Paper text:
F1Fo ATP synthase is a biological rotary motor that utilizes a rotary catalytic mechanism to couple proton translocation across a membrane with the synthesis of adenosine triphosphate (ATP) from inorganic phosphate (Pi) and adenosine diphosphate (ADP). The F1-ATPase consists of three α-, three β-, and a single γ-subunit, with the α- and β-subunits arranged in an alternating manner (αβαβαβ) to form a hexameric ring with the γ-subunit at its center. Moreover, the β-subunit is the principal catalytic subunit that undergoes conformational changes and, as they change sequentially, they drive the rotation of the γ-subunit during ATP hydrolysis. Here, we exploit temperature and time-resolved cryo-electron microscopy to determine the structure of the binding- and catalytic-dwell states of Bacillus PS3 F1-ATPase.
To address this problem, we froze and imaged TF1 in a temperature-sensitive dwell state detected in single-molecule rotation assays of TF1. These studies have shown that, when rotation of TF1 is observed below 10 °C, the enzyme preferentially dwells at the ATP-binding angle. Due to the temperature-sensitive nature of this dwell, we term this state the “binding-dwell (TS)” hereafter. A mutation in the catalytic site, βE190D in TF1, has been shown to substantially extend the duration of the binding-dwell (TS). The predominant structure obtained at 10 °C showed features distinct from the catalytic-dwell structure observed at 28 °C. Two of the β-subunits assumed conformations that are in-between the closed and open forms, whereas the third assumed a closed conformation. We term these β-subunit conformations “half-open” and “half-closed” as the subunit would be transitioning to an open or closed state, respectively, when operating under ATP hydrolysis. All three β-subunits had nucleotide bound, with these being ATP, ATP, and ADP + Pi, with the Coulomb density corresponding to ADP + Pi being elongated compared to the other ATP molecules seen in the other sites. These observations are also consistent with the expected site occupancy of the binding-dwell (TS) suggested by single-molecule experiments: the β-subunit at 0° represents the state after ATP binding, but before the ATP binding 80° stroke, the β-subunit at 120° has ATP tightly bound and the β-subunit at 240° represents the post-hydrolysis state, with ADP + Pi bound. Starting at 0°—the binding-dwell (TS) state—β0∘HCTP is in the half-closed conformation with MgATP bound loosely.
Numbering used by the authors:
A (entry chain D): 2 to 471
B (entry chain A): 26 to 499
C (entry chain G): 232 to 287
D (entry chain E): 1 to 470
E (entry chain B), G (entry chain C): 248 to 375
F (entry chain F): 232 to 352
The structure:
């Protein structure tokens, strides 16, 4: 009971299994062939099943390029979904979508258990709703949009704003804070960044308690689509057996939505909206709903999103926005201003900025900060085109402190070691919230604004000025 | 015969051979145990939309007919439990036994059977009850951007419905399982799940279940409407129902209409909402008022689904993203929120203070666009400043705690008659908290009067009784 | 000089107010044309989807 | 005659196979009435309209009631004619569905009553008449500044909350009260609540036996919504043919007649066109609006409310309706925010029957001076807004004083406002309308304050109100 | 018939835009794929096959004539739309009649800058 | 027409001048007859083979060493929209291009030449 | 081949959009299900197969390079269209040229506001 290939149309293939032996949907298939003659080409290729057709035939998608496929090749049926090896063995390694290790360190044995990629989501009975503030050590995120365990978190931006630099600073700070497993998925990631990140994590020695999944842009669209679910199935083993908080990072899900749109067009369905497939909310929900806090522990996730043209009504961002618990917006104007990670104080929102979850002082502090920056945002054009001396002395006070606040949300970073070389550091929550209480009190208003860039404490700001001698 | 064989499987659609004596809309049960509605009886191949996970089904799996039209089991047992649209429980409390079944698709009450609407539905939201009245059998639309507090207004409306026999319903369409759990626990904490049912189909469920979830929601309410008890139905979001229907139609190969929705979208929504109206005294005087919710991108209400729905409903309530992020809570805009059936159901005591309040907010909202100077004209302009400032202070509400009606009337009277005008603006809120408890202790005769008369307290002692509180406030 | 400076601030206030009115009117006309252009593009896209769907 | 069987059901659409070759014509009617043979079945009563032939004896139909519970192999009978509405005096003062059965429980019509086909070929070019007569409605604004004419299609357009059903009741009652004009009402796609409100507002006004009513509402399948509009026409055609008298026909919303046609065309399977409408928009619209006429016996003048789909008059449906209409009245929200009622704008409202001879060169010249006065006011208040009142000379000052008198006197007091506000009402013939406005245009009456004119019938009523007020 | 015999003629078509709409409706009742604004490309050939039978024959043929005045309806003055420009390519001029002037009391008005004749001078008398 | 100009510049060797009155109607006539031939629409109803067949014709009109051609062409933009496929494919092939715009012509400026969008090597 | 020997290389593609159009016309004639515009769904994969061969090989592999400079012509300042968004997602930077800048005297016209280089800073000489 092995199938035979009967059409090829690029990524799509058709296989005519003998009836009585048809695979399920989302099942997996192997081609291994060695060429009989000189003209032929040796092939090792896997396919996934995507819908059934009229008689015996099944319509499938290919995870490696179909070049060299004859008609009438034998297809092996695995009888199961794409199976990913799960265990502690995967700590430190880099994998492809099918679970083979890309790095040359070694090969996972056949004897180990492997878990299916596709599994039903958490039920209504099993789910729970704990609330705890996740101390990330990033001065904007901890002050103005506090992250929470158990939940989907979102980073929205254009291109080249800091999304990957920031995701690296997260992975490093969490590896210092806890020996909690991390899984990183580069879904449709440029093969260049994969080299940068693998060597940065090997050279800072952060990789001992992490795993990595990659699918590059030069992969078929189906292989770009299924890479996020491999990362899910790995993080799910660590929660269910080890029972501890296991972060899942996804490098950009915009490529994932587009890979689904291209697969639907190859399957011959009819577009909608700006050409996205019909089943946009379904597929994305299927992914996003597994990220949860059931009774064993957590799988809190931090994801980044490309917003094509600074208009957020495009289907992929708009469909994503409902699922996310807390979202911070990255704007290129601040990144080019050289204050980092570029996150807008006014446009960032979270569920967790309420006194019952975060804390009484934290609520009063954050709302004073945002009111100060909002009053600065409406005062700059008068400052530009009337004389700056015309601003009232109370508004002049709001100006002076808004300058300091805007700079002191910048922070010196371990990931800057590659780009600029400086050491950086980590800030616990208490020191962020107190330092901003120091900023808002105003006794330190004598120290100059230039000092406040790229620092981790108000004592560091005193030191930098001290070098300047202030 | 009864049996047939599946012979295609799409992305949740299927087609089946056999089933020769099937009928359109019949529920069909597959061997796996998921069930499907037979949408199209074409010449040889029955189209069979699958509700639930479809991965297990293969070509040649048997498919069989239940013998019944699409129906949800109903009874008195359901109240206090959480069920999926097909009517099975998800809470974990065990099986539920209901002895009656209602077709989800039915003829609504005809134009002979209906009535005019005249008895109000007290929400406990100050701004809704004061300025945008609702009544049993009204259809009313709450519209606004994401993260604007709409579900807070729904849960405030479903709590504070205790003595009034408003058997209520909440329908969760595509929602996050964590928020459905959070709301169910908030209902359980406030002692409010004795009189309400909760229906859920979540994003992991395929789109046909989302499309069916509102129809089975109203079909539960129809038992109460026939028998004679009042009802309320709330939908978490109708826009996601529109998106689920679009996906279902396009997988069935139908061509799009304007702005890539099918045109059948107006028939779908107009079918669903216009079953919500008050029956006649001959048929039991029941009710089935409904609260659709719909979301607007950027806050533009001129888009296709908003204007389509605004045509069917008898009012709109507009929630401002701009005010809500400024922190005015709950945020309602006086210019753009109005109801057609309102003005009749509202009680006589409220009618006197409601008209003055409506003019007060309408006049202050434009004048606030010019207000920041402090010295502009003489007191004539300022009085509108002073009144508008105290008005906006009094209309804000604490999160998730609903207000009682006779104290709601008495605070609006206190505001709209000018007793607050000397009271300093900074401490205006604290006045309400102290007043509610004091008025219970010292003012009970006024509460009995409103409960007796539907009318404002006897005006002679009304000032004196309010003055004793005003002195007691410090 | 006092009347001159006061009347200058009045003259600038009215000139800036009228200029704001002209800016608002123009924005309205442009928004109407932008909506017409986008709706025309979307209806063309939908016409191509129908022409593909029957052609295949 | 003969009996068929059903062989497809695809929503409202049903396909039927007539074995003998005794096929039905287009627009013919077929009936299914069935009672359950076994406990598994459902009892049903159904009217089908034929809409295409499709070969091999098969016929494609659209149902006038929902198709739930239809089997395959269930039988049909052939009526032999179009859907036949009852016509005579036996349909006065009573409410029907599309099939001609009574919605009211008051009773039903006997089997002796004659029935007319709904679908009948239009009147010939020899049978028309060119003579134009003004319909004298008694509404001051409409009769002065956009005179309606017999045989004329008239359109009401306006904002979502203006007065449209209020005016349709106000015209119905005025015609029945004084002119005695027997008149028919069709509801297409309006709320069922207002269907019962209109029934009780008729009963409260006492205008009940004189009129007849048909309803097809938003719960109806699209085919029934489409054909109810033609039932109302067929009743008015009986009144101006056989009883040979003046008639008036009301349609509540024509756009949903077009929209129901688009939904049926898609179910039928014909390609969309333009902004998704059916191909046959102009012919289906035309065949209705071409039967409304003033033939040699009597007219069917019609008032119709039009909703522009997206504020876009350029859209296909409003443009095609807009080509048939002869007089248009526009109702304006920015007037209705004041006490002005009905909120009719004279500047937007137009009539092709304001021909100088037909109205009368005295009515023509008075009407043009009123329109010129309001147009000048429209520009002159912009000049006052930018420059000032004190920047304008005496005559312009008198024009603004007169324009305030004109706008307030155009408001009127009527019976529907007895429920809303309790004022008794008024009636005005056209000669009184022109007389009174002529005297206001001379301006000797300008001593009465603007407050006096707010809602009034005749200038003599203004005289009574003013002196008493103080 | 008249022009070949030798007499003059004049034709008015009371609206050609309804002819284009009727062709679209027929073409889509057939299974022909739409183009711009759902009009098939055949719309240029239809109108061109209509309008260039109008002529001024020469003495060898018999000197007859057949001037034709077609009409087209613009929607909100959109002379930049498909069917207006389609027909404007075929005809030897245009007259554009303006609503803005007409409802400002100028009954009738012609928009000078939009309306041109390509046979000017030749047609006029010398005094003109 | 082109085959004539080709013979004179090759065999006789004179410089040749070619005029084509409106070359858009070649592509439009292809658009009409292509759908009946039986091949799916493209970006706005055009045939698939727009650029290959239009390029095939335009690449013959060349000044070889044997003898020069200068050729002056006009192209009707289907509406006042240059982003249409048939103008878009043919903007590449032309050494010097003149853009005539309606808005200037209505001001009464003739010939109505777009000063900013006129490009020549 | 030259990069495998170890010498630096540069490849320029003078217009990728014309390659994409040749694919569209070739696929449509082959009767393949179309997508947005009418571009076949394979386009992003086809360009990624082209653009991910560019590399900077390690010292173990020879130290070579293959920098690439693809060009795309946008229609009227169009953006968010299918080919430009595909290529803008693949490439590690983008330069956007503005026509209204060019006709204003800036040459070569380059908008600093919308042009980004993710690699930037590292490549420059220390003085730069
Ligand atoms: N009176 C109030 N005081 C304080 N907070 C309020 C008040 N009313 C509403 N909120 C807050 O508004 C927020 C709005 O979130 P809500 O629970 O309504 O989800 P939502 O607005 O429907 O967004 P989505 O539909 O995307 O989940 C809630 O966090 C709620 O705490
Ligand atoms: N003549 C009038 N006198 C007093 N109030 C009026 C008058 N005309 C309109 N109104 C006001 O405007 C409202 C218009 O109600 P109406 O029943 O006409 O709605 P409608 O515009 O027909 O609704 P729809 O367009 O959905 O059918 C009335 O309820 C009343 O408040
Ligand atoms: N702290 C920093 N110091 C210096 N340069 C930085 C810093 N953060 C970001 N950058 C620069 O900005 C770039 C941002 O690009 P990145 O967000 O990594 O792109 P992508 O998200 O597409 O991978 C970095 O590659 C680097 O060149
Ligand atoms: Mg990246
Ligand atoms: Mg909500
Ligand atoms: Mg109405």
């Amino acid at each position: 009971t092995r199938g035979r290939v009967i059409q090829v149309m690029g990524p799509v293939v058709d296989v005519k299994f003998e009836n009585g032996h048809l695979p399920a949907i989302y099942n997996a298939l192997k081609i291994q062939h060695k060429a009989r003659n000189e003209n032929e080409v040796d092939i090792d290729l896997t396919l996934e099943v995507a819908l059934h057709l009229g008689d015996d035939t099944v319509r499938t998608i290919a995870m490696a390029s179909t070049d060299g496929l004859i008609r009438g090749m034998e297809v092996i049926d695995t009888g199961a979904p794409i199976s990913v090896p799960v265990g502690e063995v995967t700590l430190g390694r880099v994998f492809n979508v099918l679970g083979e290790p890309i790095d040359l360190e070694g090969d996972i044995p056949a004897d180990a258990r492997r878990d299916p990629i596709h599994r039903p989501a958490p039920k209504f009975e099993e789910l729970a709703t704990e609330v705890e503030i996740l101390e990330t050590g990033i001065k904007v995120v901890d002050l103005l949009a506090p992250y929470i365990k158990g939940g989907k978190i979102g980073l929205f931006g254009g291109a080249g704003v800091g999304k990957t630099v920031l995701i690296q600073e997260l992975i490093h700070n969490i590896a210092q804070e806890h020996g909690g497993i991390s899984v990183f998925a580069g879904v449709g990631d440029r093969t260049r960044e994969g080299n940068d990140l693998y060597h940065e994590m090997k050279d800072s020695g952060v990789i001992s308690k992490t795993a990595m999944v990659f699918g590059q842009m030069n992969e078929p669209p189906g292989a770009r689509m299924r890479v996020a679910l491999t990362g899910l199935t790995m993080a799910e083993y660590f929660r269910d057996e080890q029972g501890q908080d296991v972060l899942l990072f996804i490098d950009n899900i915009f490529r994932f939505t587009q890979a689904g749109s291209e697969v639907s067009a190859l399957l011959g369905r009819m577009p909608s909206a700006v050409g996205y497939q019909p089943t946009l909310a379904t597929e994305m929900g299927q992914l996003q709903e597994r990220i949860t806090s059931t009774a064993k522990g957590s799988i809190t996730s931090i994801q980044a999103i490309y917003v094509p043209a600074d208009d957020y009504t495009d289907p992929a961002p708009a469909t994503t926005f409902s699922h996310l618990d807390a979202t911070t917006n990255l704007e290129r104007k601040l990144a080019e201003m050289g204050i980092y990670p570029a996150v807008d104080p006014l446009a960032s929102t979270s569920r967790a900025l309420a006194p019952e979850i975060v804390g009484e002082e934290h609520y009063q502090v954050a709302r004073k900060v945002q009111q100060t920056l909002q009053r600065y945002k409406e005062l700059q054009d008068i400052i530009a085109i009337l004389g700056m001396d015309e601003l009232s002395d109370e508004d002049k006070l709001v100006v002076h402190r808004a300058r300091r606040i805007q700079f002191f949300l910048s922070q010196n970073f371990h990931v800057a070691e590659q780009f600029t070389g400086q050491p950086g550091s980590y800030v616990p929550v208490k020191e962020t919230v107190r330092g901003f209480k120091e900023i808002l009190e105003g006794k330190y208003d004598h120290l100059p604004e230039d000092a406040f860039r790229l620092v981790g404490r108000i004592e560091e700001v005193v030191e930098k000025a001290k070098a300047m001698g202030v | 015969s009864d049996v047939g064989t599946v012979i295609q499987v799409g992305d949740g659609i299927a087609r089946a051979h056999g089933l020769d004596n099937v009928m359109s809309g019949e529920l069909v049960e597959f061997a796996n145990g998921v069930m499907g509605m037979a949408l199209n009886l074409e010449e040889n191949n029955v189209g069979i939309v699958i509700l639930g996970p479809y991965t297990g089904i293969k070509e040649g799996d048997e498919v069989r007919r239940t013998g019944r039209i699409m129906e949800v089991p109903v009874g008195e047992a359901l109240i206090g439990r959480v069920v999926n649209p097909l009517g099975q429980p998800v809470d974990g409390l065990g099986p539920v036994e209901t002895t009656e079944t209602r077709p989800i698709e039915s003829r609504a009450p005809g134009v002979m059977d209906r009535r005019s609407v005249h008895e109000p539905l007290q929400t406990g939201i100050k701004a809704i009850d004061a300025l945008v009245p609702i009544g049993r059998g009204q259809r009313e639309l709450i519209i606004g951007d994401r993260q604007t507090g709409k579900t807070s207004v729904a849960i405030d409306t479903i709590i504070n419905q205790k003595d009034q026999n408003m058997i209520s319903i909440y329908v969760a369409i595509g929602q996050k399982e964590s928020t459905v759990r959070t709301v169910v626990e908030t209902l359980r904490k406030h002692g409010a799940l004795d009189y309400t049912i909760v229906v859920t189909a979540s994003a992991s469920q395929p789109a046909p279940l989302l499309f069916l979830a509102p129809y089975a929601g109203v079909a539960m309410g129809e038992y109460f409407m026939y028998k004679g008890k009042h009802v309320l139905v709330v939908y978490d979001d109708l826009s996601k129902q529109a998106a689920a229907y679009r996906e279902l139609s396009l997988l069935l190969r139908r061509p799009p209409g304007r702005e890539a929705y099918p045109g059948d979208i107006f028939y779908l929504h107009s079918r669903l909402l216009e079953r919500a109206a008050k029956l006649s005294d001959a048929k039991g005087g029941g009710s089935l008022t409904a609260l659709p919710f719909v979301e607007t991108q950027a806050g533009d209400i001129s888009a296709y689904i908003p204007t389509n729905v605004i045509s069917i409903t008898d009012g709109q309530i507009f929630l401002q993203s701009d005010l809500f992020f400024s922190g005015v809570r709950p945020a309602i805009n006086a210019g753009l929120s109005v109801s057609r059936v309102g003005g009749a159901a509202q009680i006589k005591a409220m009618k006197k203070v409601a008209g003055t309040l409506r003019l007060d907010l309408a006049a202050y909202r434009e004048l606030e666009a010019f207000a920041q100077f402090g010295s502009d004209l003489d007191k004539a302009t300022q009085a509108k400043l002073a009144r508008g400032a105290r008005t906006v202070e009094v209309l804000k509400q604490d999160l998730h705690q609903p207000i009682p009606v006779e104290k709601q009337v008495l605070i609006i009277y206190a505001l709209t008659r000018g007793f607050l005008d000397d009271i300093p603006v900074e401490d205006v809120r604290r006045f309400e908290k102290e007043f509610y408890l004091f008025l219970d202790q010292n003012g009970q005769h006024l509460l009995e009067h409103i409960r007796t008369t539907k009318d404002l307290p006897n005006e002679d002692d009304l000032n004196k009784a309010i003055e004793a509180f005003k002195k007691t406030f410090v | 000089l006092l009347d001159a400076k006061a009347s200058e601030h009045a003259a600038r206030m009215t000139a800036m107010k009228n200029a704001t009115d002209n800016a608002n009117e123009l924005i309205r006309t442009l928004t109407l044309s932008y909506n017409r252009a986008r709706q025309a593009a979307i209806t063309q896209e939908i016409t191509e989807i129908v022409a593909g769907a029957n052609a295949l």
